[PDB]
Amino acid sequence: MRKITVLSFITLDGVMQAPGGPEEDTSGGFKYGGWTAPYEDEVSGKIMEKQMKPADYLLGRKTFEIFASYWPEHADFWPGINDGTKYVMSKTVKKSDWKNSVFLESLADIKKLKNSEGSDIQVWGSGELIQLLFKNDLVDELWLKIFPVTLNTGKRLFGDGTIPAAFTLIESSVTPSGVIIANYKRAGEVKTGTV
Amino acid sequence: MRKITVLSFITLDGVMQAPGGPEEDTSGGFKYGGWTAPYEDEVSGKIMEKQMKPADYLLGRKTFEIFASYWPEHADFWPGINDGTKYVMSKTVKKSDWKNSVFLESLADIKKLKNSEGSDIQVWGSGELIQLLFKNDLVDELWLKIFPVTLNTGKRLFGDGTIPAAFTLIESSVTPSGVIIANYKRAGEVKTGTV
Ligand SMILES: NC(=O)c1ccc[n+]([C@@H]2O[C@H](COP(=O)([O-])OP(=O)(O)OC[C@H]3O[C@@H](n4cnc5c(N)ncnc54)[C@H](OP(=O)(O)O)[C@@H]3O)[C@@H](O)[C@H]2O)c1
Ligand SMILES: NC(=O)c1ccc[n+]([C@@H]2O[C@H](COP(=O)([O-])OP(=O)(O)OC[C@H]3O[C@@H](n4cnc5c(N)ncnc54)[C@H](OP(=O)(O)O)[C@@H]3O)[C@@H](O)[C@H]2O)c1
Numbered sequence: 001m002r003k004i005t006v007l008s009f010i011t012l013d014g015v016m017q018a019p020g021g022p023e024e025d026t027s028g029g030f031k032y033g034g035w036t037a038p039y040e041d042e043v044s045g046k047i048m049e050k051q052m053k054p055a056d057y058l059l060g061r062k063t064f065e066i067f068a069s070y071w072p073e074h075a076d077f078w079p080g081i082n083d084g085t086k087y088v089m090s091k092t093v094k095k096s097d098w099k100n101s102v103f104l105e106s107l108a109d110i111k112k113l114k115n116s117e118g119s120d121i122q123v124w125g126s127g128e129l130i131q132l133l134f135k136n137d138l139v140d141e142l143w144l145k146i147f148p149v150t151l152n153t154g155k156r157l158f159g160d161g162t163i164p165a166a167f168t169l170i171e172s173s174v175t176p177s178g179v180i181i182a183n184y185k186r187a188g189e190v191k192t193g194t195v
Numbered sequence: 196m197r198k199i200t201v202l203s204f205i206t207l208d209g210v211m212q213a214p215g216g217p218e219e220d221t222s223g224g225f226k227y228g229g230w231t232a233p234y235e236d237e238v239s240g241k242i243m244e245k246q247m248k249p250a251d252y253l254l255g256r257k258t259f260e261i262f263a264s265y266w267p268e269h270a271d272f273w274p275g276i277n278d279g280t281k282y283v284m285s286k287t288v289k290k291s292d293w294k295n296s297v298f299l300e301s302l303a304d305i306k307k308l309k310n311s312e313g314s315d316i317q318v319w320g321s322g323e324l325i326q327l328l329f330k331n332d333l334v335d336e337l338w339l340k341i342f343p344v345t346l347n348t349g350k351r352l353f354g355d356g357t358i359p360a361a362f363t364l365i366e367s368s369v370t371p372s373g374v375i376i377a378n379y380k381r382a383g384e385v386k387t388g389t390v
Contacts (some may be wrong), residue, residue, distance in 0.1 A: 012339075012362065012379070013353035014209055020390040032359060037388030048272040142207075145378075148362035148383055150353060158208030158345060164227060169205065169373035178364030180377060182341075184207070190344055193232030194216045 003120040004058065005141040006053060006130055007158045011034050012146060017128060017155035024066065025155070032151050039147050039177040047173065047181060049129070051112060051143060054080040055122045058110070058133075061090035061127030068098045087113055087121075089129050107136065131161030142167065142184040164190045197308070198315040200254065201325055202246060203352045204231050207341065210349035211322050215380040219261065219349070227346045234342055234372045241378055242368075246338060249275035250317045253305065256285035258320030263293045282316075284324050302331065309333060326356030334381065336342055337362065341375040359385045 009019040018024035018033035025033065059067070075082040085100045089110070094103050104110060110133070114121070123130060133139050136158075144157075169182035174180055174181065213220035213228035217268055220228060238351040254262065259281060270277040279296045284305070299305060305328070308316070318325065318334075326332050334358050339352075362379040 013357050022387055022389065032385055032387055033388030035385060037390050038386040040390065063305050146208075148364050148379055148382070149360070150357050150362070151359045151385065152357050162208055162345055162347045164346045165344070167345070167373075169227055169369065169375070172375060174364070174371050176364075180364070180367060180375060182375060184343055187343070190227060190230060190346065191229060191233045192208050192217060192229040194229050195214075195232050195235060 001115060002074045002109055002118060004123060004133065004138055005120065005142040005143055006133070006139050006157075007129075009145045010157050011035065011148065011149045011151050011154075012070070013150045014156050014158050015053045015151045015154040016125075023162075027155065028153060030156070031156055035151065036147060039175070039179050041176050044175050047175075048145075049083070052078055052080055054084055054119075056084045056119045057081065058113070058121050058123045058126070059086060059088050059125035059128070060129035061088055061093055064088040064090070064093075064096075064101075064130075066125065068096060068101075071100050089126075089132075096109065098124040107132065110128060110138065127155045127159065129159065130157065131159050133161070134163060135160075135161035137163065137165065137186075138181045140186050141170075142182075144180075144182045145183070146180040146182065147180045166190050196310060196333050199309060199312055199318060199328065199333055200315065200338060201328070201334050202215065202290050202338040203325075204317075204321065204340045206230065206283045207343065207345045207350050208347075209345045209351050210348035211320075211352040211355055215315070223348060225349055227349070228342055229385065230346065231340075231342055234370070235373050236370060237370070238370045239340075239374065246317075247273050247275055248307045249279055251279050251314045252276060252279060252281045253308070253318050253321070253324070254283050255321035255324035256283055256288055257323075258284040259285075259296075260288075260293075261320065263291060267293055279314065284321075284327075291339065295304050302327065305333065306331075316354050322350045322352060322354065325352065327355050328356070329353075329358055330356035332381075333361070334382065336365075337377075337379040339375075339377045339379070341377060
């Protein structure tokens with residue numbers, strides 16, 4: 001069994017659509033593409049230069065295609081995304097000219113990939129796919145960056161597929177710009193009591 | 196002009212409902228009341244102590260009635276809520292047995308209270324009222340406790356009133372139990388660039 005970590009940038013109110021630029025995702029007429037931009041410093045760059053080390057990858061087709069239009073030309077900056085296998089969930093795509101790209105189609109195939117032998121899997125973007133992974137408790141770890149911003153609309157990290165579940169805060173950090181780094185571990189079932 | 200702070204206990208996915216006990220709020224058949232119970236410790240107690248200093252209060256009727264059923268009999272632990280004036284939004288309750296209870300019926304009333312002179316206003320619970328506050332940008336600070344848990348359903352802090360807006364992280368820390376204390380300051384507009 002391989003470990004699956006979901007890495008995500010989110011607003012205070014859990015929005016994750018289009019962090020990196022105004023046209024990254026125009027779904028719904030979303031007007032705040034790029035909201036992650038004003039909050040980038042150099043300690044953040046180091047923090048997730050460590051989070052960008054070589055692994056394998058699991059992606060929704062849309063996030064795969066966003067990545068495939070950029071990163072094949074910037075392997076200097078992120079060699080992990082280019083050298084590691086990228087398993088992509090899609091029914092409409094079967095091949096890519098980006099090397100080390102395998103296309104899966106089912107929950108069953110994701111289960112086989114997790115069972116199979118190989119390096120730990122990273123998930124980036126992939127909100128819809130993440131809903132599928134959450135609903136089947138396939139997500140072993142969460143690396144979140146929470147930014148000091150609220151947006152009403154936009155795709156959400158905790159959406160349709162969220163289940164009730166408990167986590168452990170492995171570690172945390174703060175950013176000179178006001179971003180909270182929070183890395184959680186899956187910890188079984190939700191406990192209730194009385195205060 | 197008084198400082199309206201909103202204080203709130205939220206899950207990773209931002210559920211606000213019924214933090215303290217299994218029957219605290221059973222709207223929707225919510226089965227996870229008391230989700231903050233396993234996560235309370237000494238450090239949380241001290242941070243609350245600073246947050247429970249004598250202030251004025253602004254509540255939704257429901258949260259006021261939950262508070263009234265318990266807090267007038269425990270003025271030793273939380274004096275401020277008994278001594279301070281409680282401004283309660285309702286069209287249903289015009290008077291209460293609780294000392295220092297004033298009942299407001301409209302948005303204008305909340306603004307006039309804000310325009311007024313007095314102790315700074317604290318807001319606890321009151322998710323629906325909070326929605327009204329957000330929609331008109333009347334909230335100036337946010338003191339959140341984020342808990343390492345996820346629940347699907349439930350009343351959310353950021354809901355049908357959340358508006359796009361920027362914040363400044365004015366403080367943050369972590370409890371040994373794994374909760375993240377994040378206090379934020381309202382900071383003008385949302386900025387987008389290109390990473
Ligand atoms: N905040 C961040 O960390 C971050 C980082 C990067 C990107 N993003 C954003 O992430 C978003 C990615 O777009 P998206 O989440 O809407 O789509 P996505 O998950 O990246 O990919 C959606 C596609 O993946 C396939 N798929 C996903 N789930 C499936 C399922 N449960 N069953 C069968 N097929 C499934 C389908 O492919 P087919 O149609 O081909 O069959 C589906 O159309 C964008 O908004 C992007 O800006 C966020
Ligand atoms: N996470 C935390 O920190 C925390 C702490 C304590 C409690 N809570 C939870 O907060 C929740 C409080 O219940 P709630 O959020 O449903 O309601 P609420 O905001 O506490 O009060 C509901 C009542 O307030 C009045 N009201 C609120 N907004 C109004 C508006 N825009 N216009 C006119 N009147 C308005 C109305 O009174 P009338 O109907 O009387 O006219 C409404 O019925 C509970 O679930 C509680 O468990 C959370």
